[PDB]
Design a protein around this nucleic acid. Structure first.
Ligand SMILES: [Mg+2]
Ligand SMILES: [Mg+2]
Lengths: 153, 60, 394
RNA sequence: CCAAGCGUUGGAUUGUUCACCCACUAAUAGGGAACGUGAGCUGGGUUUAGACCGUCGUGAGACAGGUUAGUUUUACCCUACU
RNA sequence: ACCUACUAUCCAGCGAAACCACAGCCAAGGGAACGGGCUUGGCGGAAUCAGCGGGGAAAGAAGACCCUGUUGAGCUUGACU
RNA sequence: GCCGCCGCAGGUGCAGAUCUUGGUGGUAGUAGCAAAUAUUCAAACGAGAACUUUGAAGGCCGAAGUGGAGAAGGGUUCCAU
RNA sequence: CGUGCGAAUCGGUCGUCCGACCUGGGUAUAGGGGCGAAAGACUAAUCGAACCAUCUAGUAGCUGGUUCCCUCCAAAGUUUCC
RNA sequence: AAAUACCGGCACGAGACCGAUAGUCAACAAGUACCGUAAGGGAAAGUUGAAAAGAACUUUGAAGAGAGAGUUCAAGAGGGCG
């Protein structure tokens, strides 16, 4: 199918996708824009820091009701949380992309993520009960993810 | 793995509650694959399960 | 409509910016004015509050109902460690403001002064003031200091000396010294510069700066509490039990035609950690620190004229979450602003103190030194053991 | 006259605005803020129907004439304050 | 004035509703005779978090008060048939 | 599969109507996951155990029970893989 | 609590408890009618005349709205009557 | 008996009627599913590819979910596919 960003070179670059993941759209977009421009080893170290709760993700656009923290002073922002589930799914996605680079016959340490995008998805339908007999929704917000790796020395 | 069926059957055989029943925790996979009451009677004859005694009430 | 049963307010207007201040040390806002009539002395001093105890003194004043009688009062203990001088700094009088010219540092800068610049004392390799101290062993470095002596003579008016507290004598956990500017009252600019050059890298005594029975000013930082309410901070009239939406809030804040709200009505916010300035505190006694000569130590601080003993001001079992006062101390009237292990600024009086009540020599009779923890009833260990006799395993 | 800087209470009754009395002080001066003021409280009386007595209307009803009990929802959105 | 528990606050997972012409720095003037928008004067210098209720003539219900319509219902009488 | 030209015909021209149906936003990652005391360790099939299993310890309901069985009612909700 | 667990629940708290005591099943009483120790009180989340369909697209001197362009002409809030 | 009426049913034909929120409410397993104790009320819903030639083969991963190949004129038609 037609993608959003065509690759500059099919030999060096590669793509991978993840469809229908039960993760939040805002948190997934924010961690994608945070991990978009780093090296793969620094990205794995950052995911280890998220797992050990050492380095959080700052929220600059969707900034509401989030407490301040000192560990986000490296990026230059007050708020910060740890999207652990989205981090585990993107860790599986980077593992699948590294396997795709291995199937293509690519180098390991020279891979740099260049582009990643979080697109919308059809939502589920469930509800909960409240007072006076009024049905109110309990809907989710799934998303589709695509990412591009490129060897840059 | 799952002994909620064998606890109910042991309570039904010993004709008491399932609280005062002591199972043998040594070989769980060897005890669990019984699938009949004849194997339960064989385990009773071997003497692995123990009917736990009544909690005392000292009238002294 | 107006208020029928009138009552003006319950609150202060001089302290309405209730925010947490950026500064830590209590800074002197108004310095004393210099004049050639006064000799060389220091304006302000920096100390630490240690404790609080009773006092026994003789009251003698004319016309009062109580005359020639014995009373008790609450007196403070402020430990006053000596400071190390690390140089001076000049200030030229500009029409825009008060601008400095050049900061002059000392040769042997102490490590307690070097701890202020560095954040991590272990990781840092101590690279500050390595090439700056090369000016002390050559002719080119000494000519720069000689030309600054004549350049600061013409334009620089106010010369403030730089000092820092000696933390090495204190057994406390912290080791970082507090830098402080002190204006020098004295003669001319040349005499002030010669006195600063003579007293460079010297210990600052307490008795030469502050003396007996002077009504001095106290500057300190209020102990912080946390985010408190309008009732907890302003202490207004409370609402009775019959209220529905709470009984410890401000009921009527605004009105219809004043559609906005101002700071006239008392509001909630930050309570604690604020700057204060107390005035009119009487000095009673300047205590002496510990000293040892020929083995026999001298600790006659609590020993008054009528004590007929020889012991220090340390209570039974030490102080309460403070430590031990190893250095010399001073004793003031009332209670100062601050808390335990809090920095404190002593300041000379700006107003001309000429009052009938605040001019009286205090006869030191007795100092109560007992264990404030629990219920202490003894002054010293030998008196307590003389009362209690032997023990089980003596 | 300059002059609003700082001050101008408590209690018995009335639902009371208003009005009266006592004790005291320095004065116990007079007002506004959409009749200042409920996503700030209170319902004592008015101001849903239930009943009592008195008058009038033949009659359903009316009484500046009373008595008695009568369901008070939500700020997490913006500005302003801290 | 003080204490405990349940609260409230931060982190992992999940995750609404009301409201919505558009947005919410002020004073004076006039007006459908009380405006955030018009004119003139003051000012306005990223983005969020815990309180608060002054304002948004805060949401509600084509007012539960009054009157009219050659609009309808119940009670009651010696109105009319 | 469609356009122009000569005559004729219409269910033929939308911005509203607290218009109808359907779809999507600010709100908003906000409020919230508080009626009734209490759980803590070892191993385990399994990739994976604050919630599941057994073994141990500490408690609650206190015979008017957080117990066993019935009727109305529900209709395979009972058990095995 | 009051956008609830709840289109009427819970805490403190009571009146009564061998007699004008509550009540399990079958049956009689249905709408200008029934029941009612009398409150237009109740009659399936609805009772100053129950629910559904038809007449009915009942009536409305009254509110709400009523869709392309260009050109020319160019108004009255009144005499009298019901 | 004769010329008179026919909206339901048995067999058709025709149309300046409508074209998937339109036309019978229902173009499909429609008075069907569903709601109400009941007389009763009453929906949503078309367009793979001419032809299934419906993806064999390798790898990541527990599987889900990817990355290369194959078909065909094109996947620009990828199992809810004009
Ligand atoms: Mg004490
Ligand atoms: Mg009173």
């Amino acid at each position: 199918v037609r993608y959003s960003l065509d690759p500059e070179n099919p030999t060096k670059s590669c793509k991978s996708r993840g469809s229908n993941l039960r993760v939040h759209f805002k948190n997934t977009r924010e961690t994608a824009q945070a991990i978009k421009g780093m090296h793969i080893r620094k990205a794995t170290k950052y995911l280890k820091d998220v797992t050990l709760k050492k380095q959080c993700v700052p929220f600059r656009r969707y900034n509401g009701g989030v407490g301040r923290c000192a560990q986000a002073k490296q990026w230059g922002w007050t708020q910060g949380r740890w999207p652990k589930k989205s981090a585990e799914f993107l860790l599986h996605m980077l593992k699948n992309a590294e396997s795709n680079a291995e199937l293509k016959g690519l180098d390991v340490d020279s891979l740099v993520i260049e582009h990643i995008q979080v697109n919308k998805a059809p939502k589920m339908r469930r509800r909960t009960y409240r007072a006076h007999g009024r049905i109110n929704p309990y809907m989710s917000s799934p998303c589709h993810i695509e990412m591009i790796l490129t060897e840059k020395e | 793995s799952m002994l909620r069926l064998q606890k109910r059957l042991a309570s039904s055989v010993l004709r008491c509650g399932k609280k005062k029943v002591w199972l043998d925790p040594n070989e769980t996979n060897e005890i669990a694959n019984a699938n009949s009451r004849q194997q339960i009677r064989k385990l009773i004859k071997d003497g692995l399960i123990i009917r736990k005694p009544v909690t005392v009430h000292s009238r002294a | 409509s107006h208020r029928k049963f009138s009552a003006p307010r319950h609150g202060s207007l001089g302290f309405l910016p209730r925010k947490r201040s950026s500064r830590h040390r209590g800074k002197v806002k108004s310095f004393p004015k210099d004049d050639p009539s006064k000799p060389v002395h220091l304006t302000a001093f920096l100390g630490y509050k240690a404790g609080m105890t009773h006092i026994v003194r003789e009251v003698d004043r004319p016309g009062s109902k109580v005359n020639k009688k014995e009373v008790v009062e609450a007196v403070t203990i402020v430990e006053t460690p000596p400071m190390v001088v690390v140089g001076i700094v000049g200030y030229v009088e500009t029409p825009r403001g008060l601008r400095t010219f050049k900061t002059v540092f000392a040769e042997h800068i102490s490590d307690e002064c070097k701890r202020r610049f560095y954040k991590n004392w272990h990781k840092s390799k101590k690279k500050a003031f390595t090439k700056y101290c090369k000016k002390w062993q050559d002719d080119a470095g000494k000519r720069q200091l000689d030309k600054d002596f004549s350049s600061m003579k013409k334009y620089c008016q106010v010369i403030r000396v730089l000092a820092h507290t000696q933390m090495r004598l204190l057994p406390l956990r912290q080791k970082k010294a507090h830098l402080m500017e002190i204006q020098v009252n004295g003669g001319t600019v040349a005499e002030k510069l010669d006195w600063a050059r003579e007293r460079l890298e010297q210990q600052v005594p307490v008795s030469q700066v502050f003396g007996q029975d002077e009504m001095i000013d106290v500057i300190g930082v209020t102990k912080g509490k946390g985010y408190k309410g309008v009732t907890s901070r302003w202490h207004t009239k409370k609402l009775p039990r019959k209220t529905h939406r709470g009984l410890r809030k401000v009921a009527c804040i605004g009105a219809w035609h004043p559609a906005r709200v101002a700071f006239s009505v008392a509001r909630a916010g930050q309570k604690g950690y604020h700057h204060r300035t107390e005035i009119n505190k009487k000095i009673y006694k300047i205590g002496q620190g510990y000293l040892i000569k020929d083995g026999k130590l001298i600790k006659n601080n609590a020993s008054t004229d009528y004590d007929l003993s020889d012991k220090s001001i340390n209570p039974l079992g030490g102080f309460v979450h403070y430590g031990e006062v190893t250095n010399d101390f001073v004793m003031l009237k009332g209670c100062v602003v601050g808390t335990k292990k809090r920095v404190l600024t002593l300041r000379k009086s700006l107003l001309v103190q000429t009052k009938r009540r605040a001019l009286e020599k205090i006869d030191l009779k007795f100092i109560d030194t007992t264990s404030k923890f629990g219920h202490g009833r003894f002054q010293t260990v030998e008196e307590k053991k003389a009362f209690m006799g032997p023990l089980k395993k003596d």
